[PDB]
Amino acid sequence: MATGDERFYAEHLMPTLQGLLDPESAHRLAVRFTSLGLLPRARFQDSDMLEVRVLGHKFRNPVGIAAGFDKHGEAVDGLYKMGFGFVEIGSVTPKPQEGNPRPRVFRLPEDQAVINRYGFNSHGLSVVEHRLRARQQKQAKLTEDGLPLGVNLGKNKTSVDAAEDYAEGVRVLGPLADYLVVNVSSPNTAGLRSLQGKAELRRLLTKVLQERDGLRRVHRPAVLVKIAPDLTSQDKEDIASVVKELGIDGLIVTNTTVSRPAGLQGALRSETGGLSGKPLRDLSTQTIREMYALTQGRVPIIGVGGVSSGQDALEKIRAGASLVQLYTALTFWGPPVVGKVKRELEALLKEQGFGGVTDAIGADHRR
Ligand SMILES: Cc1cc2nc3c(=O)[nH]c(=O)nc-3n(C[C@H](O)[C@H](O)[C@H](O)COP(=O)(O)O)c2cc1C
Ligand SMILES: COc1ccc(Nc2ccc(Oc3ccccc3)cc2)c(C(=O)O)c1
Ligand SMILES: CCCCCCCCCC[N+](C)(C)[O-]
Ligand SMILES: O=C(O)c1cc(=O)[nH]c(=O)[nH]1
Numbered sequence: 001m002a003t004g005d006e007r008f009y010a011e012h013l014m015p016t017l018q019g020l021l022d023p024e025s026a027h028r029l030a031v032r033f034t035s036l037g038l039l040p041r042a043r044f045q046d047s048d049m050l051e052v053r054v055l056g057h058k059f060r061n062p063v064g065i066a067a068g069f070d071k072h073g074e075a076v077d078g079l080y081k082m083g084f085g086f087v088e089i090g091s092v093t094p095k096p097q098e099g100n101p102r103p104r105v106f107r108l109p110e111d112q113a114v115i116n117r118y119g120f121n122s123h124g125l126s127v128v129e130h131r132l133r134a135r136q137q138k139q140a141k142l143t144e145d146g147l148p149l150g151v152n153l154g155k156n157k158t159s160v161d162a163a164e165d166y167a168e169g170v171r172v173l174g175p176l177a178d179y180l181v182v183n184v185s186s187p188n189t190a191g192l193r194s195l196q197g198k199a200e201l202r203r204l205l206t207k208v209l210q211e212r213d214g215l216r217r218v219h220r221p222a223v224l225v226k227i228a229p230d231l232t233s234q235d236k237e238d239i240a241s242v243v244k245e246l247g248i249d250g251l252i253v254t255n256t257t258v259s260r261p262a263g264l265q266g267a268l269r270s271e272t273g274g275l276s277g278k279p280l281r282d283l284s285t286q287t288i289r290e291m292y293a294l295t296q297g298r299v300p301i302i303g304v305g306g307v308s309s310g311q312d313a314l315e316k317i318r319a320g321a322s323l324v325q326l327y328t329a330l331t332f333w334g335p336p337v338v339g340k341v342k343r344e345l346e347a348l349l350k351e352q353g354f355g356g357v358t359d360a361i362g363a364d365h366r367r
Contacts, residue, residue, distance in 0.1 A: 004040040009334035023105040023114065023331070030330075031070060034078035042083040044339035049346055049356040050085070051146065054300045054322045055179055055222040055250055060146035061085030062357050063313065063341055066304050066325035067152035067181065067226070068116075072123040073131045076139070080147050083338040088325065089128070090152030091183050094168045096124035097156055100188070106273070107331075108266025112308070113280070114328050116256070117273035119188045120154045125172040132176040139176070148178035152226065155189070162195060163207045170211040175219035182208055185228040185255035187274035193228055198238040205246050226252035227291070229283045229305060230259055236287075240294035250300035253291050253321070254284045277328035281306025285319050289364070292320025297362050308337060310344020317357060318364040 002013070017026060033039065050061040064086040065079050073089040080087060099121025106115045123131075132139070132151075139149050153169035155162050166182055174180055182205065184195040195204055205225065212223050225248055227239060243251065256274025264279060284305025292301060303321025307313050308329030316324050329337050345357075354360045 002038075002040050004336075006333070006336040006340050009040070009336045010332070014332060014334045018107065018109075022103065023107050024102060026331070027069075027105065031075050034070075034075035034082065037078050037081055039078065039082055039335050042081060042335070042339055044083055044342050046085070046342065047346060049349055050342060052322055052357050055148075057143065057148045057178055058146040059085045059148060059323060061342055062317070062323045063338060063345070064088060064150070064302070064323060064325040065330075066327035067091055067150075067183070068118070069327050069330070071121065073128045076149065077135070080142060082335050083342065085146070086148045086150060086323065088150035088152055088181065090181065091120055091122065091154030091186070092125055092128045092151065092169065092173060093120050093122040093154045093156045094125050094159070094165050095156050096127065097122055104273070106266075106268040106271045108264065108268055108277070110265035111269070111277065111279055112328070112332055113264070113266060113275055113277035114331060115268060115271045115273040115275050117188045117271070120157065120186065122154065125169060129172050129176065132173070136176060143178055149176075150179045150181060150224075151177040151221075152181040152183050154183050154186070155192070157189060162191075163204045166204065166208050167211045170208055170223075171215075174212055174215050174221050177221040179222040179224055179249070180212070181224045181226045181252055183226045183255070185226050187256055187258045193230075196227065196231065196235055196239065198242065201239065202242045202246070205242060205248060209246055209248070222249035224248070224250040224252050224302065226255055227287070229254035229257045229280065229287050231287070236290055236294060240291060243295060243299055248299070250302065251291055251295075252302040252304060252325075253288045254280070254305050256280065257283060259283070276305070277332075278306045278308070281312060285316050288316055288321050289319040292362055292365065297365065307341065308333065310341055310346070310348050313341055313345045314348050314352075314360065317360045318362070320362045320365065322361050
């Protein structure tokens with residue numbers, strides 16, 4: 001069934017799977033299989049070249065699974081087995097909520113893209129907290145061994161107080177996380193991205209950071225802000241300013257886009273939702289570049305958006321990312337894409353005269 005092998009997955013297994021299952025069903029199955037550890041052998045051995053020290057942690061490799069794949073913290077261990085250097089779970093909302101009605105995920109095969117409007121379907125903080133607690137010491141050892149865990153926090157659709165939603169997330173899941181993500185960037189919850197402008201963003205993040213600072217040292221995560229690729233130059237300037245003013249630990253750049261770039265071919269291109277995958281790639285990379293420059297290279301960036309190769313990863317790294325994430329590439333190429341990206345990244349680093357990933361971070365800005 002599953003042997004096992006970049007070409008077999010890309011050319012045969014995944015196309016067949018996608019012919020049989022709609023994207024959300026495939027997503028549910030992928031989560032189930034991953035949680036059981038039913039995966040092809042991750043042959044790739046991580047070299048010292050790929051190791052990154054950032055956010056107060058060691059990362060065995062700079063390739064993570066983006067938020068949204070494991071929304072409820074169900075497959076964390078299987079994701080490490082897949083070869084990810086770090087795992088981000090979420091977004092998690094304070095209370096459980098169902099998200100949007102189905103269908104709410106759409107493939108754009110011709111574009112190597114996906115559009116989703118899940119709408120923060122979440123088991124909620126309490127369920128995710130107990131799920132994480134069940135493996136807390138296991139995670140502590142994984143983190144020690146260079147495999148950190150991120151938790152992405154959302155807010156409920158019907159919440160009257162957005163900042164309090166995030167504050168609850170910090171208090172409940174913060175003690176279980178190496179880093180937290182304040183997701184102010186979903187396409188798919190009304191109002192949400194408006195948390196990205198200035199005086200209100202400052203208010204929100206001050207509250208978040210205060211809650212984080214009130215956790216015991218051993219349970220005190222880094223706090224990152226995940227931003228949209230659709231921000232105005234003014235928005236980006238404002239975010240960079242608040243980030244530096246408040247001492248936000250890092251940025252995740254970017255979420256999905258509500259733009260529909262010219263050239264999309266998929267029949268479903270005009271579905272409502274965030275677009276991910278290849279058509280997002282360079283928009284994300286350019287946002288990384290801008291944010292790195294606006295923060296003077298002093299604020300760690302996790303680069304995400306259309307990464308499916310070593311070149312994609314390195315471009316983001318050279319643009320200013322210390323780490324990268326992918327999601328959409330996994331949906332088309334399956335688990336072997338993780339080793340592929342890592343292998344290609346290591347080769348490109350050597351070819352371009354970099355001693356390791358760390359040496360390449362922001363290299364474009366020094367040209
Ligand atoms: C199906 C789907 C669900 C997602 N859910 C979340 C989410 O819950 N929280 C979040 O911060 N990002 C979410 N994302 C955005 C991804 O984390 C990532 O930022 C974006 O997809 C770009 O990366 P990619 O092109 O590699 O997929 C989701 C993306 C997709 C494809
Ligand atoms: C919207 O969110 C997703 C998530 C996973 C997907 N697919 C997928 C990802 C990993 C898989 O993992 C495997 C592959 C082969 C053997 C065992 C597990 C399988 C399907 C898809 C899709 O098919 O469109 C969509
Ligand atoms: C998730 C869709 C099914 C794809 C085929 C499953 C691959 C099983 C992996 C094989 N094995 C677990 C032994 O390595
Ligand atoms: O749950 C979702 O709809 C969602 C959240 C998010 O942050 N990004 C995204 O593309 N979808």
